[PDB]
């Protein structure tokens, strides 16, 4: 599983612990154990979301399984919970992309997981 | 709707005003008002196309509808003509990847 | 084509001449001719991989057609064996989604494919 946070807020603003609790909550919330499980945090972007420039973010949650309209929802309370106590981002400026791979699409070490 | 423009042009090449730019555009050209539309660009990028690095773009757009044959090429006219006019990029180092999103999987706002 | 890494190996460990290879490998390994492909190869990044911050990357490689279950099996040896060789990231921890595009939904040269 795979969570990337792309952001406007500066580097400076990104809690020291931030990845390990990201991969912690993750991991948590959808029972994925830690190891398979990749975060990815790129502040300092230059972005708009609604045409202004205040704090904002563009995340996408890859998972193979674990993705569908009830867990999408709780996923995104906690995410957007997550980005707004830790990175001080409005839950009104976040999109999360959720992503149901195939095992077929996916590639990890010489292989897939299909 | 979210549109995001990867490319190896210098920060300093992007006109101010860009984004907005970006936004009024592809409210006009889509029907999404502008206050629904993210736009994100990463310029200094690493990159090459067809084993060149002269300047190109690697885009993506995102929505939930507003998605098809034709829609698509009319975005690709508007966005690459942007990307000419604005960053110096030609047309023909661009790619665009569109991505027609189900509502079911966009979080937003503390739910989807 | 494109491919794209994100890694959190340093700029100056990524060797000058990857972005090329990667690009001739890629055309060898799926037919596409070398000019139809794109690369981007982002480092620095800030990342884990299973809690831990030792080298990682997550990647994609995007294509009309030339994707499939036995392809994308191929394609991982190919690109873990020169991720670990040109920029020294153990393969168990590299994740490379693969996307098998619609060509109405890829724009080029103000049109789409």
Same mark, same amino acid.
């Given at each position: 599983?795979? %969570? ?13 612990? %931030? ?5 912690? $909550?993750?991991? $948590? ?5 830690? $190891? ?19 704090? *904002?973010?563009? *995340?996408?949650?890859?998972? +193979? ?5 009830? $867990? ?7 995410? *957007? ?7 001080? +981002? ?22 897939? %997981?299909?």
């Amino acid at each position: 599983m795979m %969570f990337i946070v792309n952001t406007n807020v500066p580097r400076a603003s990104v809690p020291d612990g %931030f990845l390990s609790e990201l991969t912690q $909550q993750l991991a $948590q919330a959808t029972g994925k154990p830690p $190891q398979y499980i990749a975060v990815h945090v790129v502040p300092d972007q230059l972005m708009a979301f609604g045409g202004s420039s205040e704090p *904002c973010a563009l *995340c996408s949650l890859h998972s +193979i399984g674990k993705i569908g309209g009830a $867990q999408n929802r709780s996923y995104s309370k906690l995410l *957007c919970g997550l980005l707004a106590e830790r990175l001080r +981002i409005s839950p009104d400026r976040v999109y999360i992309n959720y992503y149901d791979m195939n095992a077929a699409n996916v590639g990890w070490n010489n292989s897939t %997981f299909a």
